[PDB]
Amino acid sequence: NSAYAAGVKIAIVMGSKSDWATMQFAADVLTTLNVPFHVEVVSAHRTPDRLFSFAEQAEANGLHVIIAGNGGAAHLPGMLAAKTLVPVLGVPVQSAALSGVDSLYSIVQMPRGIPVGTLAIGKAGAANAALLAAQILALHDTELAGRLAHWRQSQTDDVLDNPDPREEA
Q: For every residue of the chain, which 3-state class applies, written as one string?
A: CCCCCCCCCEEEEECCHHHHHHHHHHHHHHHHCCCCEEEEECCCCCCHHHHHHHHHHCCCCCCCEEEEEECCCCCHHHHHHHHCCCCEEEEECCCCCCCCHHHHHHHHCCCCCCCCEECCCCHHHHHHHHHHHHHHHHCCCHHHHHHHHHHHHHHHHHHHCCCCCCCCC
Contact 141, 134 (CB under 8 A): no
Phi, psi of 134 (to 5 degrees): -65, -35
152 in a labelled binding site? no
Q: Which residues contact 28 (CB under 8 A, 6 or more apart)?
A: 127, 130
Resolution (A): 1.4
Q: Identify the experimental approach.
A: X-ray
Contact 77, 68 (CB under 8 A): yes
Task: Domain ranges for the chain, please list them.
Answer: 1-169
Phi, psi of 40 (to 5 degrees): -160, 145
28 in a labelled binding site? no
Q: For every residue of 33-70, which 3-state class applies, written as one string?
A: CCCCEEEEECCCCCCHHHHHHHHHHCCCCCCCEEEEEE
Instruction: State the architecture of 1-169 in CATH terms.
Output: 3-Layer(aba) Sandwich (3.40)
